[PDB]
Design a protein around this ligand. Structure first.
Ligand SMILES: Nc1ncnc2c1ncn2[C@@H]1O[C@H](COP(=O)(O)OP(=O)(O)O)[C@@H](O)[C@H]1O
Ligand SMILES: Nc1ncnc2c1ncn2[C@@H]1O[C@H](COP(=O)(O)OP(=O)(O)O)[C@@H](O)[C@H]1O
Ligand SMILES: [Mg+2]
Ligand SMILES: [Mg+2]
Lengths: 373, 192, 42, 373, 187
């Protein structure tokens, strides 16, 4: 019947795009723009100017890869527009001017980022309408809940947003730049410790793959370190794209430990468990029990094996012993935000929340600060 | 052939007249309920939303009139079949914009909302019907002469693949430049 | 105003046809690649 | 339709010239200039001053043969100009001023060589346009590939050039001066061990013919040496131009082995297999697999029976066991460079890459460093 | 430098020739203040061409290669490396520090090591970092004339300190803790 809406979660690392009503994104691809850094000799090829998404991921040997989104803030707008092209016309293969588009954004982002997003979506793609949602609210939508504190840890931003009975508490929103990309950089730094030197952006992608394949969160960091130092059971091997085999030991759990000890990368902020506890304690006393009982995790960085148990133990150590602490970690949480957006894009009520281009034309880009939280 | 699209053209005209009536009724509802302060002033002549949604309906009517003219040109053999789907896509964008604009500015279960939605869906479906009718009537619907071509010489064959592959990359450059030109002309369309 | 937009769409779609037939031509060459390539070159 | 272009590969040892679009060079002849070293006594004959190409090869008894090109660098410009004149007017029998000419050059050559080639082409032969291509790129063209590491071994220069998706990696280019002529000199030196004394340049040509006819690369050098020292099945016979018959044993494989052990001729560099492996290892880690799978061979020096198997074994012993090593050695590789040039000279796209004499007269001979890799 | 000396016809291959090229680099190379203007000057005039006598008596003459070699420190792409030049790495290291200490770091750029002995490298570093840093900030490159031995001099100073005498990894601690003790007593 009605024209389906487009849901485009523009994460720092990955772009997840699809249609409203679907249960999984139709296009999941890295948000990178690669440009050749060598000299083309053959005349029949080596001539394209820039590669976007998976194509660049297949040609990282001869490319310089750049992420247009850094810490949830779009820094290169031409690259972001190119990525939105590759999403709409190549991956989804639809016309954005007939489908309303739902975009996502981390909380406490600069206003100019959201205004430029609106201006590009309306003046370059001419969508009928658009809406910028907060990723944590969508993550809560995905879990079928109205009460809970959402810990969303993407590639570039990790934020805690407490929500009670559909009401957000903006003063209790916590944001932390420590995220997956910083974990990848720390993994590179500590892999140089065993003699493996990864420098180029392609080697950064290789290290990110290593992190996604072998890293896990230790239940007890000190005991795990002692076990790794005494026994060799934790040591695991991995084959590089060139055939070299590397072996990593304690680095499997030292990299995710930065999530709980940000001082490893020289940051003064507290770990994710302490930020969650502080966010809960900033809320009204009457809702802390429900917030304790409804910890919802989302984002790729929360897909580490054993992260839920560690978070539960830490918050149990912090919270009073009488409270019941439950970490909700659905197996599909890496797409939770997008899934939530799909749900929000299928609701009949939300059809009144769109920012139509009539309002954009009469009020300018500032309208996005009067209609979106 | 031409009479087939003409029947669909009259269906288009009836559906767009229904759009005009429904949009007028919705404007009456909006001004009656105080949803929007309708002003009987033609800002920037028709513009896009001068005097409200009636201008959007009128621009939809202009777009679909262009669509009908494109279909007539195609059935006379002066317009490519890709002109028809381009005008149809513009019409679809216009009606989607109008429907979404009326959707958020009016009551949840307003009857006028239902009339606008049904009439816009009717225009969309009838537009696809007209487009498919014109394309199938068009003789250039399907045509290809690149089935198999080979060269005996080893030098000639590899040169052939390299020339074709350069044609690949040249058309892909055309992708980039054409999209950028379209984006620029869209930004210059109103520049707020 | 909309005339320029529709013209740009015209160029986009006609060139899309060009890109598609170029794809077809490339594949059409590729099926006969073995014919003028020696056995060790496939 | 369009005037066909001339493809002239001026190798260190052979000149291969022809027209674009042809599948084989029309004129392949040695690049030598001979001058009489005796006294002429009869008026009727023996008055010509210098002999070029096959004419000198037929009269080596009374001539001093000199190669104007040594190690890919043109040393005698008068002789090289004479050779080019012989190529254009006697072998090809065409006017160079109506056909654009495509020339070849080894990588990492002196800039003055390329500038002098351009100046001679434009001011002596007055060609409409000209272009200097890198021989390895043309060799890759001839194989119908866009990715691979080309090992081009001619008469004076051996060089490894890796290319990935049409992009060359100049920092990974390897050049080794060991080539066919050094093999011929070493064959003379080791043939002196059996009492055969070849000293004059004509005797050098005879030894070159012996090398082309009887030499081969041993799969395992030590086992082959033991077999030659025990059995007599490797003793091949060759008839000299004067009727004398020579018999050679291990020298059949001890000469080409210099390609894998340059220390045989006092060179400190590593063999061609190690240079290929090092050139691969200097490339980005993500493209090493494709290079391992696309080892392209070209040039006359790679025509030894069993050289591909030996190179495959050596690189497999060097590379990680997981990766597959594939040596691409077409039977027509001795002309591959030229063939590739022909292809590059037939492309409609390449027609914009010519250095026209307008650009030469406005920018000077230095223009060849801004339009040719 | 070996690779770009092959451009003038000088072929250095063996390790001994590598030592000869290293000596050439130490004797004739320098850092240009403005790379493009220096290249234009070298391409126009011969004032930048210097001669050098090889150990075998041959005299070689090098022009822009005198400054095109050290320029790799600021443009690593010359050797196919994707990383940024030393000035950009210094600026990034400063920007990774706390905002309150960036002023003192800007005013105390210390250079050491042989590769920083190039004539005019301090001025080029100062100009590049000034172009990168905010205009208000004062930037000072500290390049002592003996900076080729700065590491050893600092090591001597540290080893002469009475306080450092307690940081020695004694062979007593080595025999009970093994080689892993060096990861607990040294930064
Ligand atoms: N299975 C996994 N284990 C550990 N880390 C992962 C896993 N999958 C993804 N990641 C990390 O999560 C990041 C992607 O998170 P994502 O949810 O896509 O965030 P965004 O919203 O920014 O796209 C990647 O950078 C990757 O390093
Ligand atoms: N069948 C063969 N076996 C061994 N060596 C050969 C053979 N044919 C040619 N050569 C050697 O290769 C050299 C010619 O190589 P070529 O491909 O002509 O290089 P160039 O680019 O210098 O012309 C000659 O010196 C010859 O010694
Ligand atoms: Mg996310
Ligand atoms: Mg050759």
């Amino acid at each position: 019947d009605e024209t389906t809406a487009l849901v485009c979660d523009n994460g720092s690392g990955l772009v997840k795009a699809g249609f409203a009503g679907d249960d999984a994104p139709r296009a999941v691809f890295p948000s990178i723009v690669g440009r050749p850094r060598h000299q083309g000799v053959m005349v029949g090829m080596g001539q394209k100017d820039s590669y976007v998404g998976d194509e660049a991921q297949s040609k990282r040997g001869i490319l310089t890869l750049k992420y247009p989104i850094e810490h949830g803030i779009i820094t290169n707008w031409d690259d972001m527009e190119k990525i939105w092209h590759h999403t709409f016309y190549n991956e989804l293969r639809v016309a954005p001017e007939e489908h309303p588009t739902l975009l996502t954004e981390a909380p406490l982002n600069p206003k100019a980022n959201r205004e430029k997003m609106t201006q590009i979506m309306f003046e370059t793609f001419n969508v009928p309408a658009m809406y910028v949602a907060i990723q944590a609210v969508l993550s809560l939508y995905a879990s079928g809940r109205t009460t809970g504190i959402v810990l969303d840890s993407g590639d570039g931003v990790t934020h805690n947003v407490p929500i009670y009975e559909g009401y957000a508490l903006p003063h209790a929103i916590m944001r932390l730049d420590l995220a997956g990309r910083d974990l990848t950089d720390y993994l590179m730094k500590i892999l140089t410790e065993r003699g493996y030197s990864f420098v180029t952006t392609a080697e950064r992608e290789i290290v990110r793959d290593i992190k996604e394949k072998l890293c896990y969160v230790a239940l007890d960091f000190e005991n795990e370190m002692a076990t790794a130092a005494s026994s060799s059971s934790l040591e695991k091997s991995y084959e590089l794209p060139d055939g070299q085999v590397i072996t990593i030991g304690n680095e499997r759990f030292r990299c995710p430990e930065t999530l709980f000890q940000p001082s490893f990368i020289g940051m003064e902020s507290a770990g994710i468990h302490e930020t969650t506890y502080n966010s809960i304690m900033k809320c009204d006393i009457d809702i802390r029990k429900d917030l304790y009982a409804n910890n919802v995790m989302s984002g790729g960085t929360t897909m580490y094996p054993g992260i839920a148990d560690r978070m539960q133990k830490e918050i149990t150590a912090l919270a009073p012993s009488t409270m019941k602490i439950k970490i909700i970690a659905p197996p599909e949480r890496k797409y939770s935000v997008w899934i939530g957006g799909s749900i929000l894009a299928s609701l009949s009520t939300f059809q009144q929340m769109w920012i139509t281009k009539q309002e954009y034309d009469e009020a300018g880009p500032s309208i996005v600060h009067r209609k979106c939280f | 052939f031409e009479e087939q699209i003409l029947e669909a053209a009259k269906s288009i005209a009836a559906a767009t007249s229904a759009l005009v009536k429904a949009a007028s009724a919705a404007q009456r509802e909006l001004v009656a309920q105080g949803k929007v302060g309708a002003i009987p002033a033609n800002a920037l002549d028709d513009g896009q939303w001068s005097q409200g949604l009636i201008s959007a309906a009128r621009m939809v009517a202009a777009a679909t009139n262009n669509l009908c003219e494109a279909a007539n040109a195609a059935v006379q053999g002066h317009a490519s079949q890709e002109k028809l789907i381009s005008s149809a896509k513009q019409v679809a964008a216009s009606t989607a914009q109008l429907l979404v604009a009326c959707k958020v500015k009016a009551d949840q279960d307003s009857e006028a909302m239902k009339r606008l939605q049904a009439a816009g869906n009717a225009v969309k479906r009838a537009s696809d019907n007209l487009v498919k009718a014109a394309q199938k009537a068009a003789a250039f619907e399907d045509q290809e002469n690149e089935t198999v071509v080979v060269k005996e010489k080893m030098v000639g064959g590899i040169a052939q693949i390299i020339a074709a592959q350069e044609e690949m990359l040249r058309k892909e450059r055309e992708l980039e430049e054409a999209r950028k030109k379209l984006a620029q002309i869209r930004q210059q369309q109103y520049k707020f």
